[PDB]
Write a protein that binds this ligand. Structure first.
Ligand SMILES: O=C(O)c1cc(-c2ccc(CNC(=S)c3ccc(-c4ccc(C(=O)O)o4)cc3Cl)cc2)n(-c2ccc(Cl)c(Cl)c2)n1
Length: 123
């Protein structure tokens, strides 16, 4: 309801990427989901997520959760709680968050819009 950004864990993106906080169970909004390029393997999805202050596209989904995307329960605009995630740092220094467990709290259809005015996070 009122003040929609109050429904999101403002500051969680910075906490994850800066402080190395992996204990939080932040509530984030999905802004976009797209497949990455895969070959002979299960598909893999990349997500642009928002905590209300920042967006960040450095997220990929555990493949065990693919059905959430493919059956449309996890889609752009939905609000989700991340129950478990890990971080992998690439050779070039970029960090990637792999979402291992998450819960859809509000469906995309029940939210319907990007919440707030988040700006891209600068790693
Ligand atoms: O084509 C593409 O477009 C493509 C490609 C990729 C891509 C990049 C890096 C990697 C390296 N693989 C890593 S970062 C990774 C590590 C662990 C897991 C993991 C643990 C448990 C599970 C599971 O249960 O599924 O998965 C997964 C990954 Cl993917 C891979 C792809 N990227 C890419 C580029 C930059 C970023 Cl910030 C992101 Cl989110 C994705 N784009």
């Amino acid at each position: 309801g009122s003040h929609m950004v109050g429904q999101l864990s403002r500051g969680a993106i910075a906490a994850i990427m800066q402080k190395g906080d992996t204990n939080i169970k932040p509530i984030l909004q999905v802004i976009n989901i797209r497949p990455i390029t895969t070959g002979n393997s299960p598909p893999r999805y990349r997500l642009l997520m928002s905590d209300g202050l920042n967006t960040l596209s450095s997220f990929m989904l555990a493949t065990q959760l693919n059905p959430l995307v493919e059956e449309e329960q996890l889609s752009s605009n939905c609000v989700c709680q991340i129950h478990r995630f890990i971080v992998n740092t690439l050779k070039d220094g970029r960090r990637v968050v792999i979402l291992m467990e998450l819960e859809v709290l509000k469906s995309a259809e029940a939210v319907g819009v990007k919440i707030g005015n988040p700006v891209p996070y600068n790693e």
